[PDB]
């Protein structure tokens, strides 16, 4: 079973053959103070900003304040063992993380050390944590779909390959659920997934990993973890490590989806770091450069043209464009979007999905507010059929909500207004969807066709859900080839509409909800 | 289940490597303690000063 | 060896020879008059100066006093020897009985369990309280948080949870009083002794009268005892009387430690200070910890950073509202803000889930209608809206329940309600079976049969 | 004992505190404002006979001492939800 | 000059019937104080084990208070309201 | 720490001493001025909030080994800003600037045992080419390193100790 | 030779100590080797003796205390003239389009004084945009300044794209686009759009994207202003487009705290109004040449009370306010007629017909805004029949102001419409009168000219 | 599988106990830069048996 017990010895012994006797030279400094994870270092004349500073043991610090006669650095780990007068060695290295294909299905901390207990990492080398985003001339327009599996999101608010779509809302409104369902849906789409957990408690991450493992999604996903207990440096650096890990795929011509969970907690950790460094607080006690943090973080998510990929790969990969899609999550306290961090993140991203408590309590789950939510890429990210169906739908629902506000006390409704009110109520009922139940493109297209072409009109509101379920089952058993054609091509034509109309008529005649 | 078993086996192997390394270097320390030579020390000094 | 050089409230600076500077979190000792005062190291300043927090009253300290360096952090007794006794933050006995027969002492500052050790569990834990187990059920080994303002009834709910949960749990229990009333601690201890259940509970008490250091560090001692009981392989119950005071003590001491204020004047390390404490209260593959924590809400502002940070660490959250309490409805649980991780059709099953969501939707519709009702009155409503209002009011009344611990207030005897009875009653109310009964019929009734019996006499 | 305008005390700590440059918290009171009242009010208690005997050095036996307190707080516009109340 | 005393105030039954400044100095014209020594102004309240439960009645005259809001010996009872109420 | 505030005074004093070719006397005066600052009663006097001129004139009284025209001016300038406590650091920065001006560097050598003169000569010769300055070695051999030698100049460190090799090897774990 | 040394590196702010007789002047450029890459620093303040505080025009990462800094005795100078056309340049005037060297003949400092009082002009020649609400409520003038106010996601970018497609193509003259703090994707899409439509040869692009350090975003707008001023001084008429003015002040706010300034107002830098005036006063039409400018202005949380949007209001001539409240209904362009205004909207310019139509529309919408409050609670039956008629016709006008843009077909899926001023006037006159009382409200939504609203009514 | 690897670890101990013998390389062949005479000829087995 473990005959390797002999060979591990040879593996250990060959290290001595690998070791080097050369006497190196390094710059040296001494710790003068230790407090709350921040250390002040005297000396280190050659220290660079952002440099990795090596401490006693295998611990590291990041140099941030290069003041005269003193260096301020933050410890990336448990700082309590440090003491005044300890000797500190300045390396030449910037922060780097393990990166590669082998990270899939592994749980690693912000430093890249595997914490899942599945043994050491297989990886393809190391990449810098801090890196610049591709310039203007290296990008390509976003025109490819990433399917969320949610009717509301995929219809009204399309997300494209290379888009930055903010998920924003109050606590306990389903922000995490939507993102993990988006991760689950990618199990067979070929898009790699990265889930970055900032400041969440470890048991929640255990539950998330268990849910991803209950489906086939975990083998396609990388999980980066920075629990609430870990030092602020690790939490604030966590998104960048995930960004670099996703950028690994983006430059080779593969698609990656990266979920930043609670960037607000990253901003909180950075505020703590800045205040401990005695930097001047700005508005809401946040440091001034907090916008630069999120802006330079989020600008990495982009779609690059084939030329950039060929240049990066030195001709190994030709003709393929890489893309990184980011879905940041922001928590608002009472729907107040005027707060500093929400305003910055809303300014940066290419759109937002608003989840709010009132709709969630009303039973509208997912509680996507069609009015304030918007996608700035729009129809270019959708397949042709989905675009055709949903384009009218989203504004129709918004204006229905307005009309329902207006009409609430009027006894007499014009028949056009009655049509709008009934249609809006039925469409609002239609978009509700249970958790962990993604729908394929063909099924969403079929249901939206059933809604748009008026077939839902006579059905009473409560039976609409059973109508949808029965239609899905009937079409799946009787009309599989058309579903396969729609899922593969996503095309739309006169014969496609005719077949859909025939399917709707046959279902509505023969079947029972 | 099979993947869990294989992962536990790999973890056990890495554990054994961690076990051996610490006591190995600790024994090498004593090898230095009981095999050091003043001529060897002078050789080390002269070697490093010859390449400083 | 050390010399005191500054005394600023609870913070004392001590100078040591540069070759002997104590490590962070080391315990120091200084004679203060006719008593011995313990100091805990917080920060290492330059030049051998160290900044410490006094575990006691700092008045009477002069400059230049000799300070003795203990080479270990604060260590408290643990194990079965702590069972049935009241202990100080420093692990000293506070009851008049003799010394604690300790066999082992543990440092209070410990690392959280690793990600691998964590264990998942879904065993629903039943309570006698209709609203809690209906809207926000919680599982064995999970975290429960009671959020409320001043006077809404966090402590009463926690005592009722203690009474109900202790029935089916035979393991040990730990109660940690942090910055609360001493009178409540004495009453709890006496009622535990009278019931002869004291010998299963370890009580760590640092109350509001204590200086900030005791309130700041007291919770960690209770956590250390709970961790000792857990690592033995048992199933433990942990109750924190008020988690908010810990952060409040941190805020009080933060300014003197030389840290710039943040947000609403809280310490910048608020989130890390809360997380390091909360992460240690977790069930593990070796043993499980069930935790109930009361969370004070300053000025009823649920958006304050201290309540806001706590929300993410808890599995089930019960929010108490002053407005409901003013109606006389107890427990004053707000059902539109209370939420639990366990409200999931897979675990609770479909019927419970559907009943809970129906109640939630009915109450949301009532909240939506109330603004119109306030101005135009109920007469303007549509006939279905009036039925919605009538059912919502009945639901609101039915959520009330007489508590056994509240008999000293209401006089009426307490009730225990099964989950089956509450789900059946609420489903019956929503289906309209009881639309002929008055609202008062449902007020303060244990079960629906008691509601119909009260209706006969109105 | 009936303290009058414990509120007028809290305004006074704020002045001694703001004059000492201590960072104010909610409203303008310093975070220590809870400790101020908590340590003043907590002295009002009923003590068992054993404490009386220990304090009196055996002079008084079997009698329980007590100290009732009636603090007074003044609310603006009947707002019971203010910080100090 | 630093006196050796931590802040202390005169105490004793002889204070009864006097109007006294916070330092213990009398402000009425009725001469010096007879007192039973001094006591510390800042002190720690009795601990958990030294308390006893409240079961004796302090009767204020008003019917509403003694009926609806009983006050016991050793209890702390906030009187809260707006101006001139 | 007074490190940052001592710099301008040290630089000014050194430039003045260079223009008057009197560096050694200045160094001695600075040492004397740094010693009186450490006096226990003078420490309390300096801690008190006396007026700058009275504190200065009281400080000049305790010094009769100062070049009055320049040393008194220095002390009065530091007194007017309350920097008198910085004198022990002004002295150190003055020494450092003098050593930089004379292109001379101190080097500390640590080894398991006393070195031979030839090894010391080779070390000094290598260091003089490394720094392009004259060097002055001092030997502070240590009980804990069991072999090898450590060379420290400024804050650049070259380690050849066997202790360093042992720890650097364990790091490959 | 290099004569200075870095002594502090905090964030994006670097302090350099020079000899006391060669202190760099304010706004002078500095050069330092950040490893392989050359880095440029801009001097902001002279303080102490020989020390200067500087903003790095690039990433501060990798800088060390002690690095030698070369003194370039001139401010940042950028290429100007026809050579810039069709090229994409950064804040420093370096090509970033991979097309090769700029090959300029002249270089200009980005910091320069505004035109003097005597040189200004008042040639308010009316300009048509082809948008109903903009042409009606807030007519443009040649040589004027236009601001598009709005929150995030209200339509500023698509409105500016439609304005470009309308005027800048027909303008027959040079144009400058300053991408201050823009998204890289949108800048790339705009460049490809200009290339495919084959008009890039007439336009020069300056880009400072969000990811760039605060110095680049702070100074990038001045480069565009300098190029536009070079074109203007030749005597040409040029169009200047600014991606977002607000981000310039945001970069200033970022750098201000480290520069030792105390905070003010809502945490803006104290010099907010001074910087805003300094930038805005160079965008003017002098007697030699005219600069027409359209600026998008971000409104934080749609609060027009915020000092950054509040201050810029005084510098513009026509102000178009986009409101999320209208955008929540999906009725784009979402221009608010009751907040938008223009200096040109007076009878002497527009003629009495246009002025009367605009005033009528404003009054009708104002009345409807009051009546809607009664309707919301009491219901529509409580109104007078004349108030009911006013509500109906106002609700019609509100929808008629909408218009599909054929730069938004990707979103809507519908063909764009172009409208002349005369047809807009006639349509709003007809809706104000009884000509179209019988058409439904939806009959006007995103239609275009009045002449086709009847067609949608028949189709509805 | 866990019960298999539990006994296999007890089997593994002897290979770990054997291979700790080879420590002369790790310290000696690095610090002296030449091969060395086995001065610790008795101390090597002493370390082997005492440490594991
Ligand atoms: N589509 C849905 N249908 C029904 N329940 C849902 C749906 N989406 C989420 N939920 C439920 O809502 C609750 C909160 O979900 P989730 O944890 O994703 O919220 P969140 O906004 O991320 O919360 P937090 O602030 O705690 O991180 C859970 O009980 C989850 O099961
Ligand atoms: N079931 C109940 N029946 C009647 N009254 C109740 C009930 N539950 C709570 N109360 C009321 O709650 C009041 C305060 O309760 P409790 O002491 O638990 O409050 P708390 O929230 O812990 O407050 P504090 O913040 O002051 O510690 C009591 O006076 C009691 O009248
Ligand atoms: N005239 C319009 N027609 C259709 N959609 C529009 C229009 N204006 C804005 N939108 C919607 O608003 C979204 C954002 O518009 P954009 O102008 O990019 O936002 P911003 O004003 O913040 O730059 C677009 O994706 C588009 O769907
Ligand atoms: Mg979440
Ligand atoms: Mg309580
Ligand atoms: Mg726009």
From TrEMBL, chain C:
Report how it sits in the membrane. Answer: Peripheral membrane protein
Q: Cell membrane as a keyword?
A: yes
Q: From what superkingdom does this record's organism come?
A: Bacteria
Provide the protein name: ATP synthase subunit beta
Question: SUPFAM superfamilies attached here?
Answer: C-terminal domain of alpha and beta subunits of F1 ATP synthase, N-terminal domain of alpha and beta subunits of F1 ATP synthase, P-loop containing nucleoside triphosphate hydrolases
| Primary location recorded for the protein, binned into one broad class | membrane
Q: What is the lineage of its organism?
A: Bacteria, Pseudomonadati, Pseudomonadota, Gammaproteobacteria, Enterobacterales
Which CDD domains does the record associate with it? Answer: ATP-synt_F1_beta_C, ATP-synt_F1_beta_N, F1-ATPase_beta_CD
Q: Which GO terms describe its molecular function?
A: ATP binding; hydrolase activity; proton-transporting ATP synthase activity, rotational mechanism
Gene3D superfamilies xrefs: 2.40.10.170, Bovine Mitochondrial F1-atpase, Atp Synthase Beta Chain, Chain D, domain 3, P-loop containing nucleotide triphosphate hydrolases
Task: Return the similarity comment.
Answer: Belongs to the ATPase alpha/beta chains family. T3SS ATPase subfamily.
In which organism is this protein found?
Escherichia coli O25b:H4
- The encoding gene: atpD
Q: What does this protein do?
A: Produces ATP from ADP in the presence of a proton gradient across the membrane. The catalytic sites are hosted primarily by the beta subunits.
Record-listed E.C. numbers: 7.1.2.2
The family database entries (Pfam families) matched by this protein are listed as:
ATP-synt_ab (PF00006), ATP-synt_ab_N (PF02874), ATP-synt_VA_C (PF22919)
AAA+ ATPase domain residues:
140-325
Example of a GO cellular component annotation carried by this entry: plasma membrane
